[model samples]
Target: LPPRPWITLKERDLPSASFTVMCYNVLCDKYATRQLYGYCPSWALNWEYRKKGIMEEIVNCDADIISLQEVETEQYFTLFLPALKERGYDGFFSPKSRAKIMSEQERKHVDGCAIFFKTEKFTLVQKHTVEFNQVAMANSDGSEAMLNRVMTKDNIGVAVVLEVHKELFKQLLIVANAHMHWDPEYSDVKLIQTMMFVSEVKNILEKSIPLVLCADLNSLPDSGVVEYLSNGGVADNHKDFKECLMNFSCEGRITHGFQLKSAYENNLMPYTNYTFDFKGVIDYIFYSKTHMNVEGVLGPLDPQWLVENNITGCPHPHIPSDHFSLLTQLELHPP
Candidate 1:
């Protein structure tokens, strides 16, 4: 595939403190069944073929921080972790929780989120793993019906604090990665997962620190999840709250203090998650509007390139995953 150029939002030269962040959902090997992604050729869907393309892309993008979703356990430890480590990146992984008992071998097939940061640029400060299901249970206000809705979902996320090593440009950044439930029927479940994810990340911040939250939210541009993140709050009476209770005490509202803005807000992509069955923007890289400025965003693939390549959707011979990666250049402000 041809390279996607960066769309510059700020014409000024990038400062020393600016870094590129890429968010992607690498389709898990186990989930890449013929029945699900039949549009993709079997050869192209092969893990060996996909892995080569994915690794090459990662190497070429050369992002300072990479947030990925749908990474299987074995894939993370066996391929991703080691490969990225060799390239000067230290990483963290959090797998999806299982509701039922399974052998260790079987669990390895489950997918989760993995985040990597350039070791030369940043030093780890703190890490927080979020089990959305567990958070729901802990904060449930004695509502069995509501708790059951969230507990059944095993989605997880991670937020980490990284201190910049460059003495010239001092900054501490919080980077969070998450993959929410995929089913459209469970909009409420996705919303709950988002609320808890945001809350957990917010809790990680004792004082204001520049934050970047990247995720394959599995939600459309107009989704409640998007609304809450960009708008700061969602009313309890909103459609997503129909059957789900937002804690008896929340009355009819859920809000967050962080004013997050989509890196691609100025130039929206047609679809981040593209397939024959479904096509829409479900991936995002959100930054704290107060402390960070989006210097640039990776532009979408050229329509001519897609047409010339006979690429109806992703997982084609060239593209490694059904979802496209989102990259943004962000400049962090000092405290």
Candidate 2:
């Protein structure tokens, strides 16, 4: 990964002190080129143009801090770093745990999460990775059975602690980016993966910093994984986590400590992930209400029945991806 030199501002002057943060899952070319997703057509293999378009879109968002998932290493270094460097942004990348399926001809699938922040606005403080499978394996319950299931998957989560520039004093923002298991049927695995997410957020929030979490979270809005995220993993069926939940309890898991309110829910469109057969807001940009106020969102503000017919969700001749990006602007403030 290319290193971004730390950039700082001499004078910190602004009104309502705020910064735009965007979360986008720029489709991985590595996966597409390898034909991992059967839904993708052969014509959509224009990676050079695809990365260029995505690069343009990222800059257009004008986001001070951006969290990206599904970023290939080759592109991150070649395609993203140079462009973002020109735009004055620094970054950190945590490659996802991958399967051993590798060789000179076959590049091992290793794209994970990457966070880019404007050097003038914030300084990267700490970087962390939450190994979900390892967490599952170390479960207090000693569930060897669960570990066997999770250990095989090649998914991991990454987070960054950022110190934002302010006039009076600086503020800490912990941004966690994650991608859960793709299987919608394995609710248990999804929930466990999210538990690791919660644990990471909880650990970061312990230092009393506000948090912003973004992800493609393959699980649906109604899925147990989401329920755990919103309710602190304490729904009726989540009794197995009762003890753990109590230990790290929060008033409103999504609105209090590690408190994150969905930007899309702020008087905007209902969905973020649109597909031919399925349409919902699975992708999200969640933030701490105590520390910031939502200015607006950069995404579909209304439901578009544009699915069906020849083209599927995205990755068409126009959009060129399965999902669209959601950019959100949030102001920094004290609780």
Candidate 3:
């Protein structure tokens, strides 16, 4: 419903070589509450109404690949899967690790990551789900104190290998989606989750496949998460390590090999996750710089219009989620 123009980076009209990827954090239905978003009208928070707006935006985006975060499992199975299925999209879901032990009824409320791709454009090759808490155990030093602190968080990531349908393309592409821990107080936990997710995807990508990481990292540009992903490394003396009581060390190898670049790194939006108390950019579409070039990206919402209309927060009549969706057109270099 928002008139977000496409910001063109390069004028390449090769459809086969070009594909669009959209990353959105569709606010979890259960989490949409009056306490958190009092500024929003009660009726606007209604899932029945919001769902329609969400679907409308997604269909309008018409991206080849869609990476969605904060997607509740119940809605994924009942609404999203069926709706997107008819629209020619096949999707995969990876719930939080705690859901593995949650009761059926309880698990429905647990939110995680969901990815969808146009069936005609690409064929799904492999899918890997990473439960960050479990990853912590693997890195644990067999100490209860360290394990206790790290094992409580339930953040997760989903990575998929997609093979293009066209005969001209043979190499697979890695698309990883995730939602990091929300708390800023536990910056240590957040960084650990971010690194483990990145590390896990690196393991999945044993070859030179291009990687597209779409996520709601919940960290700003200056945070360690962004530093590690965008800058390629994070020093051990980073501020996040100040209160880090865990034994899993990022001492010698806290860096990724991928040449990562965010679509909105230079032209950042005023806010991706807007609310009453907080407003900032926390979502990103990081693609491998070596294998892909940006063609265009969905422009930010007009701040002037938002202020004139008295729309300070999200879940507006037309805006469905607290976080705005990011869509980018990427042209792939031949491998």
Candidate 4:
């Protein structure tokens, strides 16, 4: 299949004073044609071979900072980060915990979370994993039977803080990345997980550096978790950032609705059924209120690549990932 045209990155005419950060959840590579459950002859063979091409396309976007999830291994990073660095960017991949029953294939695909930054623009000073034991969400009656059960095998949250332009901000810019559990029907579990995330983030914020949290949070804007984060002093960059830098007026608003309806209609999806309401914002770049002055959030770029490539079905082909990427620009105030 021919590559999508809009995926090409065009040089921008804007002033060179700004820094851009993008948060993306590249659906794990398991979606490749050969791997597509019970498929024949693998017509979408390019999906596997195009991984590097996809990364290069993203790199061409000229992002200064990037946080990616669902990367499954050190080998995967070995394949791409060097390419990013070749373009003057440095990156860190959060190590994945040992899976309970690691198959060689699963191990190969287990790369968890990572943060990449422009080396000339920032330095990575600290990295850590926010580990939360799977908590059982009890029912209204307080019975385990009514509670939602999660497998203990999920990866814990991971975050990285880059000490960027200390002469400018004199502080670290914390970029936390994670792929939260996706069982939205179980609100109790989702809420508890979010609370746990908040508490953990609070500990990081108390250290006095500005925080810019980004993630593939599976809940919608109206969900309790979204409200919790937005109301808890975390600035929703999607809604509050300056408007001039945005790719489109709708950028940063609905990173992921369903894939079929809205994504397809907008030609953002090749064949998916997801639909996002105008006000339904999900997938986020949230900054701490104390440091809002330094961050410029712009996103929700509806990539024409996914649509033109015919990859928008219940399971997409060319794009390979189910979620769209979100980008934001951050300018730290001189500390």
Candidate 1 stretches with Cα past 4 Å from truth are: 13-16, 98-100, 168-170, 243-251
Best by lDDT: 1
**After superposition, candidate 3 runs with Cα above 4 Å error:** 13-16, 98-100, 142-146, 167-169, 243-253
Better of 2 and 3 by lDDT: 3
Across 171-266, the per-residue lDDT of candidate 4 in tens digits comes to 567777766665545544444445555556556655566666766667665565565565542222533211211111113331211111111112
**Candidate no. 2 TM-score:** 0.81
- Each prediction's TM-score versus the true structure: 0.94, 0.81, 0.93, 0.68
The candidate scoring highest on TM-score is: 1
The C-alpha lDDT values of all candidates are 0.85, 0.67, 0.84, 0.52
151, model 3: CA deviation in Å?
Answer: 1.8
Candidate 4's C-alpha runs over 4 A off are 1-17, 31-47, 95-99, 134-153, 167-169, 233-281, 293-320
State the weakest 10-residue window (summed lDDT) of model 1: 242-251
| All candidates in order of lDDT, best leading | 1, 3, 2, 4
- lDDT for each residue of candidate 1 in 1-335, tens digit (9 for 90 to 100): 67898788985433447889999888989888789988888999999999998888788888999999989988999999999999999999878866658998989988888889998889889887999888888777776845778877788998889998665353688999999998998888888889888888887888478789999898887888899999988887668755334441114578788899999884468889888888889999999999888889888888799888777877888889998889888887676
| Candidate 3, residue 223: how far the Cα is off, in Å | 0.8
